[PDB]
Design a protein around this ligand. Sequence first.
Ligand SMILES: O=C(O)CNC(=O)C(=O)O
Ligand code: NI
Ligand SMILES: [Zn+2]
Lengths: 8, 348
Amino acid sequence: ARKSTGGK
Amino acid sequence: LNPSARIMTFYPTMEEFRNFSRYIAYIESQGAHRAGLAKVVPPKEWKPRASYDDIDDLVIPAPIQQLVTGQSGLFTQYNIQKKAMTVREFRKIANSDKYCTPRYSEFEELERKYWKNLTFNPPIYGADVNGTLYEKHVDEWNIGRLRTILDLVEKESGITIEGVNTPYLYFGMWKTSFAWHTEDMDLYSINYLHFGEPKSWYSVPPEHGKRLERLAKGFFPGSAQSCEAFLRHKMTLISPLMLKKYGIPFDKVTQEAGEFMITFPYGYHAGFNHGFNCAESTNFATRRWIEYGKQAVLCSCRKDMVKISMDVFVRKFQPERYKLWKAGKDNTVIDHTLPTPEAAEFLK
Ligand SMILES: O=C(O)CNC(=O)C(=O)O
Ligand code: NI
Ligand SMILES: [Zn+2]
């Protein structure tokens, strides 16, 4: 897992 | 102690600045955490990097085009990965006539332009880049090595979680956005604006976070039925006029180049970049976070979302409650007004 700024 | 739960700004001396965790305990002793967000302006003499002239060859591996759909203060952001580009290539696009910051006088004017235009001319955000622009010798507030209890994750287990216990860079342009969210595992975050145009933030006090979630669930009922924690998808944008209209308390603040923002456990925040800029960010913890970690409502519906094992923290810092917690009987209720235990020093 990693931090993510956002999805779609 | 900050009964208004307003965003506080701090100007430490270099002496105060030096011990990071200690200064976080201090700002909490002043009630800063009640706002969900705080600003720290470091001492003038402090600089994390002598110059940013050498970074044009730095690669942004997965820049995202930000397509926004919606109306009437309620939006969904779709983040579409584009091809790798360099910082040179990114800045060229950011400052071009097509994507550059519009002309404006008062900040309220730029803010209205953001909320009017956010679904047009989708920008590119150079987000989530693994790295640090800090020089190796900088020991104060180094986002690469803050030395908080969050280090127990890697120390004890070997687990690195990129952006969470390692640093991320963010290259912004006009109208690039971050959706309403709290941090992974309801951790704290730290954000340093290395250079460029401002970043503007909105925040809801942790004591009203549940109220924001209730409101969001009503506004996006489909999303809520498929995932409890759908705000963790970081796709939901809600204007301050909508918050005001439904009685959600919130505050706003603009971060300039050279300033730090701190976000606090379960503090919902959102914002946008004013123009071409560069921020560095990571997560961190204090002892107060552990209860938040224990009770964080996580996204189930996506693969390999961030989940941190709380076991090591409860054993070390809450040994009296470990058996109870492991038996699923730990009914601790979080009081969002209380500062972290380490603030005792400043309250005595
Ligand atoms: O800078 C951004 O795009 C968003 N940052 C954050 O949400 C943070 O630092 O907690
Ligand atoms: Ni955040
Ligand atoms: Zn989900």
